[PDB]
A paper describes a structure:
Human carbonic anhydrases (CAs) are ubiquitous zinc metalloenzymes that catalyse the reversible hydration of carbon dioxide to generate a bicarbonate anion and proton. This reaction is essential for many physiological processes, such as pH homeostasis, bone development, and electrolyte secretion. CA II is highly expressed in red blood cells and is essential for blood pH regulation. The zinc ion is coordinated by three conserved histidine residues, H94, H96, and H119 (CA II numbering will be used throughout the manuscript), and as the fourth ligand serves the sulfonamide moiety instead of the bound solvent. sulfonamide complexes also provide additional hydrogen bonding between the sulfonamide nitrogen N1 and OG of T199 as well as between the sulfonamide oxygen O1 and NH of T199.
CA IX-mimic is an engineered variant that is widely used in structural studies to resemble hardly crystallisable CA IX. CA IX-mimic contains seven amino acid substitutions (A65S, N67Q, E69T, I91L, F131V, K170E, and L204A) in the CA II active site to mimic the active site of CA IX while retaining good crystallisation properties. Methyl and ethyl linkers (1a and 2a) did not allow carborane clusters to make favourable hydrophobic interactions with hydrophobic residues due to their short length. The largest extent of buried surface area was observed for compounds with short linkers. Clusters of 1a and 2a were buried deeply within the active sites of CA IX and CA II in a similar manner, not reaching the hydrophobic patch at the active site opening. These compounds have no selectivity towards CA IX.
Numbering used by the authors: 4 to 260
The structure:
Amino acid sequence: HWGYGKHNGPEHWHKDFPIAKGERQSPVDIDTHTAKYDPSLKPLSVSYDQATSLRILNNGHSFQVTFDDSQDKAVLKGGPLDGTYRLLQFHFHWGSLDGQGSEHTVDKKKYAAELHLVHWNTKYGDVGKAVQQPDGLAVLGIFLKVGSAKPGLQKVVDVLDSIKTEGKSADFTNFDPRGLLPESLDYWTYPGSLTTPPLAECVTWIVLKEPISVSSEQVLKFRKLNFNGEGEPEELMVDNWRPAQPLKNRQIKASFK
Ligand SMILES: [N]S(=O)(=O)[C][C]C1234B567B89%10B%11%12%13B85%14B%1158B%12%11%15B%139%12B%1061B%12%112C5%153B%14874
Ligand SMILES: [Zn+2]
């Protein structure tokens, strides 16, 4: 039932998922002046050299690129994390226009899109078990602004015409997610949640300070996707972002001064 429209969007989700009004919901606004520099935070360790992408999929809420998470081939460690987190998939959230699309905001600024690289804690064995734990997932969030093209995104862009409508997938092997990362791994971190149903409070969020630039042509291809299935009335997959939620009793920590 849930989606991003008037009648099934974020303001409705608490009816099926009451944790929507919980104590550690995501995304949030990152108030940069209030975030505390924490000299105890480690550099983030991103080890993607042996990543194995499998498929690209439109599931009616975003598109995702899925990885082989049956071994420690593409792992996130360090930073605020204890232990080792396997990359399951990445996906994006984006807007109908360049002034909205991100889920996190920075001093209330919205970016055109936000990339989420979703990882789960190997100590829980599988993602389903991990989503039931407060330290089950680590999502690496990367902002997208519109300017110069991101060359490492183009292979993704170019196959979106083959997964237009909900329920389409395609082979998507040999994709290297290192080509989506900004120079700096400086980050903010806080305890939060999945930003889509089931909104489980299982995520350590790691949001990079440095956005990547993508071109207008690249983001326009995102906007040609459809929320609908083939044969149903065409509804552009745009504005698939949850707004900032109350910070409540949480501290955002910065890895950098
Ligand atoms: N937007 S997000 O918080 O990164 C949650 C995205 C997910 B990945 B795992 B299941 B797969 B399905 B559910 B679980 B995580 B939530 C949706 B996607
Ligand atoms: Zn997401």
